[PDB]
Design an enzyme around this catalytic site. Structure first.
Site, PDB file in Angstrom:
ATOM      1  N   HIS A 190       0.805  -1.205  -0.060  1.00 25.62           N
ATOM      2  CA  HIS A 190       0.011   0.211   0.005  1.00 25.62           C
ATOM      3  C   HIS A 190       0.821   1.362  -0.046  1.00 25.62           C
ATOM      4  O   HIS A 190       0.351   2.284  -0.103  1.00 25.62           O
ATOM      5  CB  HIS A 190      -0.878   0.066   1.036  1.00 25.62           C
ATOM      6  CG  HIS A 190      -0.664   0.020   2.401  1.00 25.62           C
ATOM      7  ND1 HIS A 190      -0.357   1.328   2.965  1.00 25.62           N
ATOM      8  CD2 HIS A 190      -0.389  -0.721   3.741  1.00 25.62           C
ATOM      9  CE1 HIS A 190      -0.133   1.036   4.405  1.00 25.62           C
ATOM     10  NE2 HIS A 190      -0.295   0.032   4.773  1.00 25.62           N
ATOM     11  N   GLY A 237       2.214   5.917  10.631  1.00 17.59           N
ATOM     12  CA  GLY A 237       3.753   5.980  10.187  1.00 17.59           C
ATOM     13  C   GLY A 237       4.435   4.574  10.615  1.00 17.59           C
ATOM     14  O   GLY A 237       5.434   4.109  10.368  1.00 17.59           O
ATOM     15  N   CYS A 255       3.141   1.598   9.756  1.00 16.24           N
ATOM     16  CA  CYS A 255       3.264   0.246   8.742  1.00 16.24           C
ATOM     17  C   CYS A 255       4.640  -0.068   8.417  1.00 16.24           C
ATOM     18  O   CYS A 255       5.462   0.629   8.253  1.00 16.24           O
ATOM     19  CB  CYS A 255       2.430   0.930   7.828  1.00 16.24           C
ATOM     20  SG  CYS A 255       0.674   1.414   8.066  1.00 16.24           S
TER      21      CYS A 255
HETATM   22  C1  LIG Z   1      -7.682   5.457  12.279  1.00 13.48           C
HETATM   23  O1  LIG Z   1      -7.957   5.364  10.707  1.00 13.48           O
HETATM   24  C2  LIG Z   1      -7.427   4.034  10.410  1.00 13.48           C
HETATM   25  O2  LIG Z   1      -6.605   3.433  11.032  1.00 13.48           O
HETATM   26  C3  LIG Z   1      -7.948   3.946   8.728  1.00 13.48           C
HETATM   27  N1  LIG Z   1      -7.915   5.298   8.014  1.00 13.48           N
HETATM   28  C4  LIG Z   1      -9.094   6.107   8.050  1.00 13.48           C
HETATM   29  S1  LIG Z   1      -6.484   5.769   7.398  1.00 13.48           S
HETATM   30  O3  LIG Z   1      -5.606   6.183   9.000  1.00 13.48           O
HETATM   31  O4  LIG Z   1      -6.813   7.027   6.731  1.00 13.48           O
HETATM   32  N2  LIG Z   1      -5.696   4.768   6.699  1.00 13.48           N
HETATM   33  C5  LIG Z   1      -6.249   3.849   5.793  1.00 13.48           C
HETATM   34  C6  LIG Z   1      -5.679   2.545   5.611  1.00 13.48           C
HETATM   35  C7  LIG Z   1      -6.544   1.617   4.684  1.00 13.48           C
HETATM   36  C8  LIG Z   1      -5.808   0.521   4.380  1.00 13.48           C
HETATM   37  C9  LIG Z   1      -4.513   0.004   4.902  1.00 13.48           C
HETATM   38 CL1  LIG Z   1      -4.045  -1.502   4.387  1.00 13.48          CL
HETATM   39  C10 LIG Z   1      -3.942   1.029   5.714  1.00 13.48           C
HETATM   40  C11 LIG Z   1      -4.285   2.209   5.851  1.00 13.48           C
HETATM   41  C12 LIG Z   1      -3.704   3.257   6.954  1.00 13.48           C
HETATM   42  C13 LIG Z   1      -3.527   2.665   8.147  1.00 13.48           C
HETATM   43  O5  LIG Z   1      -4.387   1.775   9.057  1.00 13.48           O
HETATM   44  N3  LIG Z   1      -2.844   3.116   9.239  1.00 13.48           N
HETATM   45  C14 LIG Z   1      -2.389   2.907  10.577  1.00 13.48           C
HETATM   46  C15 LIG Z   1      -1.772   1.858  11.063  1.00 13.48           C
HETATM   47  N4  LIG Z   1      -1.682   1.540  12.281  1.00 13.48           N
HETATM   48  C16 LIG Z   1      -1.935   2.382  13.299  1.00 13.48           C
HETATM   49  C17 LIG Z   1      -2.778   3.692  12.903  1.00 13.48           C
HETATM   50  C18 LIG Z   1      -3.390   4.728  13.991  1.00 13.48           C
HETATM   51  C19 LIG Z   1      -3.937   5.824  13.505  1.00 13.48           C
HETATM   52  C20 LIG Z   1      -3.917   5.903  12.047  1.00 13.48           C
HETATM   53  C21 LIG Z   1      -3.343   5.054  11.031  1.00 13.48           C
HETATM   54  C22 LIG Z   1      -2.944   3.889  11.324  1.00 13.48           C
HETATM   55  C23 LIG Z   1      -4.069   4.455   6.831  1.00 13.48           C
END
Ligand SMILES: COC(=O)CN(C)S(=O)(=O)N1Cc2ccc(Cl)cc2[C@H](C(=O)Nc2cncc3ccccc23)C1
Ligand SMILES: COC(=O)CN(C)S(=O)(=O)N1Cc2ccc(Cl)cc2[C@H](C(=O)Nc2cncc3ccccc23)C1
Ligand SMILES: [Cl-]
Lengths: 297, 305
Positions: free
Chosen positions: A41, A135, A137
């Protein structure tokens, strides 16, 4: 004496963390020999998006040194970036896929720099209750067996309930999850029964025996009770695996199952077990034996 | 999201662990530059421990009585001296893996990571705190003496603890890296016991603020308190007195969440009176006191949920 949530020493893994940038996204990568592994991703029709990328688009940073990408390919949900330089700090390693209930160490990173290490378990619903911010990931989960690092997890995403999802190092997700922005949630979770039993044996080893009783149970009667409390079914393999702990303490596994049955129906009644008012399920039988013997790496 | 007991990455400390042998005794040492630091009780027998005269035992030793092992390589000892309860063995090789470091003495309530070792080989890492009674609730077996406690803020390792002994209640006592013990303890097998322990109040408050940051407010109430009235209640539950310094230290977390320190003190007063009533806070049924205000700001997000 003492019982703590203990992680493996992280040094062999620290020497493998790098920062990966492609356009707007910055996340962590695992540099082993001349290949950097990171979530795909960082770049949805992933093959259509990847065909548009050239090697010089991926900026790889190992400390203050920039690595040169000379090739790229996708394996499931992981991106493999061929680099010009082999990691001199590459340890003896393996890629292993773990089962729910198994535990591992997580080295949490931001911008290719490790910030912390903690111990956790693969929940029966295939999620992990981790501690991650944006950050994180590309952070990896591992175990150490003598001198070999067994890489078992790469972090990809956070679920709406605050829990985490990711893949093995071959890019295959743990759980019915996909790597995109969509309506997805963790299923109903259960308690890892074999792990709670191991932890009750660790408490007996540390001199905590108030929960012991004279009673025993059949495996069938125990499972009928356990299913009512959202506990994972206990199998004959689980009973065999707890054999050493049963012989060491003198308490038969079905004898310890009767103690757990009473704890589920009556609670702790103002008491604690190993400084905890809840029944702990993130220590496997092997973690208990390793901590109450002192195995080194 | 999520809140875990998190230790510092141990790699910079792993590269410093060596094995130290004196006759029949074997424990761990910390190799920094050309000096190996280890507990001075490595020179004792089990008998000597009752009333050891360390100066008398050390004057009888020469450099070749001390066997130092770094991995498979034997280091040669070229000098030795005692500084309080630590032995300093001058060696003929500087550790090429020596990190940027400092020796710091910590105060009770402070947290640190422990790298538990046996035979100069690291077996595990965990996070813990200096209890108000100057002991640590660690996980140590025989052979763990010489294991060290540290923090890695930025790229400098701050060594704050060296393991020396297990007290009768299963808790652990040790020194700073200058050989001064934390607590009224001696490296002697004497009738000595840990004093009555108390809960680190400022740490429980920090952890309640971490729970508010992660989206949980069930425990808050509409009341406030005076610092004096809070301490009168806290003392009754074996909680450490909360000082004006603790209130000042919680300032950033208060401004971030919008909850005044004395309002958060009122929630704690209520939690102590009522218990949790089948509920948990950050996956815990007890009030957690091994996260400092600094650890919370470090691990949690800068945006409240
Ligand atoms: C809180 O919201 C989310 O976690 C999802 N989102 C709306 S996001 O942050 O925009 N989002 C989309 C998304 C969709 C698919 C995949 Cl594979 C990855 C990702 C990302 C994701 O998951 N990154 C995070 C990982 N661990 C921890 C986190 C902690 C805070 C915020 C992102 C965190 C980003
Ligand atoms: C129940 O605790 C014990 O058995 C400890 N002892 C009474 S002992 O082993 O005889 N003992 C006495 C003693 C007195 C002073 C000093 Cl500075 C050091 C030492 C030693 C000691 O404390 N070494 C240990 C350290 N950490 C952890 C342990 C765990 C197990 C067993 C030794 C452990 C040895
Ligand atoms: Cl301090």
């Amino acid at each position: 004496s003492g019982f703590r949530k203990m992680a493996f020493p992280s040094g062999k893994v620290e020497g493998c963390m790098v920062q990966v940038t492609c356009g707007t996204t910055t996340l962590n990568g695992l540099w082993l020999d001349d290949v950097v592994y990171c979530p795909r991703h960082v770049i949805p029709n992933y093959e259509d998006l990847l065909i548009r990328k050239s090697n010089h688009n991926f900026l790889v940073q190992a400390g203050n040194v920039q690595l040169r990408v000379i090739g790229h390919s996708m394996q499931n949900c992981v991106l493999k970036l061929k680099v010009d330089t082999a990691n001199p700090k590459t340890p003896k390693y393996k890629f292993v896929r773990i089962q729910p209930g198994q535990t591992f160490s997580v080295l949490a990173c931001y911008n290719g720099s490790p910030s912390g290490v903690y111990q956790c378990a693969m929940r029966p619903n295939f999620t992990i209750k981790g501690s991650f911010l944006n950050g994180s990931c590309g952070s990896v989960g591992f175990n150490i067996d003598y001198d070999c690092v067994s890489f078992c997890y790469m972090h990809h995403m956070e679920l709406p309930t605050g829990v985490h999802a990711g893949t093995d190092l071959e890019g295959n997700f743990y759980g019915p999850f996909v790597d995109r922005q969509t309506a997805q949630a963790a299923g109903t979770d259960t308690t890892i029964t074999v792990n709670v039993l191991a932890w009750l044996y660790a408490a007996v080893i540390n001199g905590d025996r108030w929960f012991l009783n004279r009673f025993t149970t059949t495996l069938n009667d125990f499972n009928l009770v356990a299913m009512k409390y959202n506990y994972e079914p206990l199998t004959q393999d689980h009973v065999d695996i707890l054999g050493p702990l049963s012989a060491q303490t003198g308490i038969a596994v079905l004898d310890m199952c009767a103690s757990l049955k009473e704890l589920l129906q009556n609670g702790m009644n103002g008491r604690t077990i190993l400084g905890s008012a809840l029944l702990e399920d993130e220590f496997t039988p092997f973690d208990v034996v390793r901590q109450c013997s002192g195995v080194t790496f």
